[PDB]
Amino acid sequence: NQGGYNTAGDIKYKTADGVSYDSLWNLFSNVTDEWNKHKSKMVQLMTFPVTNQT
Amino acid sequence: NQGGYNTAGDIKYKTADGVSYDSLWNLFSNVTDEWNKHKSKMVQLMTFPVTNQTEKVPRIGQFGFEKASEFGVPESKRTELSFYQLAYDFEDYDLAFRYTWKFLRDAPSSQIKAYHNQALQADAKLIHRKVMEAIFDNREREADIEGLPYKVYPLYNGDNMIPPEYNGTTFSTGHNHYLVSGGTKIDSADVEMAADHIREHGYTEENGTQLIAFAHKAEIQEVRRFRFGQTNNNSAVANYDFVQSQGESPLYLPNADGLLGKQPQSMWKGLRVKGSYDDVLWIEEPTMPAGYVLFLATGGTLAQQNLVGLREHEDAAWRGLRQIPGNQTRYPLIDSFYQRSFGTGIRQRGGAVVLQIKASGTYDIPTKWTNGGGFE
Amino acid sequence: FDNREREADIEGLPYKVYPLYNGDNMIPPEYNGTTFSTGHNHYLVSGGTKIDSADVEMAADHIREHGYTEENGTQLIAFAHKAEIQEVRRFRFGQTNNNSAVANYDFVQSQGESPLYLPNADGLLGKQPQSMWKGLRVKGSYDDVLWIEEPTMPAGYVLFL
Amino acid sequence: ARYDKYNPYGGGFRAPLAADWTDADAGKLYAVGINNVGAVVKGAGQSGVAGVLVLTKGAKAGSIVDVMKFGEVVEFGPTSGTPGTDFGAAGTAYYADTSTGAINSTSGEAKVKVGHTVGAQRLIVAVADGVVDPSPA
């Protein structure tokens, strides 16, 4: 993993060959991984909410 | 071809039995040509009008939590993006029609109309050739666009592009789709190899695609003899069997243990289908050169767009086939021009495979589709 | 059946009247981009003492290269003498015929022929040939050509039409 | 042979034909000149070689012909060859026999250069002022 503070210089253009860096990040703004949907299904069929701590 | 000015002396009035040549030219003045309709249909189903997009943007990295503390603070997280694009060729082509003032006085109007109908058919032959050599010529092309250089591509050709990873299979540099069969006649291992070379990039039947193979009669007549567990050419053994399309000549089923394949429908995309081996449909393609097969993916998630991009001029006044008025006029000499300009490139470098049936050595480009060779 | 060219006069002008293609100088017109030389021929010799399917297959395709194909809505008919039909009805896919040729199709008999046992409950892939054509009786089909026993036909000859 | 680029203003000229040209010459290219009467003859006339000529059909004496000096000839081959089958070599110079008007690729001191080929079937006509070598060693 990449780590650390986000800095100016981790930003690398406003646009490149006419495409905008905001539009590129907007693609990933609301994605969800089908593996994380599967993992959430497996948790849902394999767990229960604890009401009684013992 | 034949060429130069049309002259008095080229005009024929009547045959020796008294039929007028005007009536003979009037057969050619308005008819569409069935062969150039077929070539136009092959362009229509094998091309898309170019539009501008990135290639598929590679996915960002994913985070993970840290076990908390009552005194400390956690470590920081970050990611970055990347993208790329591909380009398409462009070129200009033109023909001439030069006449003398005597020829336009004396010649039948049916001959002029026949020459115009033949120019429209010369255009169909040009566009078809240029699409097919975009697929069959395995060489990278330079292009200049707005004064900058660009590279425009065939299918994967042993070059330094690496195909993107799919389902955890990672490709190297040197990936290739111009395959040599290693034998004088096609066999089922060649067909299964070639279809798997497509399907390793995605493009599978589970993704909703259809594969098509376009082949010459000399190779289809081998493929339709593949039967499960039997030996073919070159000592290959078939893992499936060829199933005829529902419209073919009748055939006895060989065994109570029935054919390993679904029966194809009569036609795909308005073309007649011979049958299927593996899950690929085989089409008898009269335009195809003898020693070659084109395998092509279609439909599903990944192949909604046809293989070859057509680029026309950016201004509508320069798109299409055009007539230019010409610069000898009325007397003594008359001139007129047809002009068209367009070009081509492949975006989906893995969406098709070209297989050549030869015993040994490297791939040969079909002479009829070598990029420098002519205009048909 | 006579492969020789003849003259005729119409209103006192001389003309030529022709057989089928016979190695003369007419070039057949191009079809599906196929280009034909001079010397094209339709009077064929089998090169073997008994008929085999490579002969049947070449003769039917020597017609169909000119157009005349099932895509254009034609039917091909073969008129033959029973000595050749009794060979042709025995052709079976991938099996060997008289001159070591392997059959690229099977012969499928028409309705109203004597019944036959098949290896499979569905038995036949595609449609069985018609029993009768133009009021003549059809034996069956091979490579989608209908075969007809024709008593006028001489012994060693087949006409594909 | 056929004309394909012709320029009426200094690319060629009208002249009267000195004798009948028969259909046996139809589609052949000849080098031509002007006789002392002022009419077009094969080879050099009094004028030397004036230009080159193709007729698409035979023509009578005293008919008017367009003699080419500068232009392009297509469907080209040497004069001795069959028109429309016996084409020229690509990339080579072509020379006229001043006696017969025959054009072929063989150079010679007394011959006149008529042009050169760009591919087999196109001759670029640009007729020389005089013979290849007026003063052989």
Place this chain on the structure above:
Amino acid sequence: ARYDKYNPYGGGFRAPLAADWTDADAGKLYAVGINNVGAVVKGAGQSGVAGVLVLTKGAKAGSIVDVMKFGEVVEFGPTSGTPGTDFGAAGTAYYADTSTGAINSTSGEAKVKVGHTVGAQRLIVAVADGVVDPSPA
């Protein structure tokens, strides 16, 4: 050098270029000929010198070029000079080396005359049929 006045009908011709010409040659004038394949090469090909050529930019092999036989060329200077500064002399004849296709004012028996200058910067192109002297003393 630049084309000022070009006439498509017998003043020049289309041909395919035999090899890449680089932008180092952009705006230079060369004499050119046709190789045995029918493509344009610098110097004499098999055709002898066919004409003269200027490209405003580099060009690829098998691209189509217009070779000039008769016309006007402006911003002219010898092939060895810098384009757009090293202009020609006024009133003088210019000759191609048949080996390299380089043009300069020095005459020589084996060279081909390509034209002459009307003022320093303007060359009247009119390419000769053959060499200056095919029979040296």
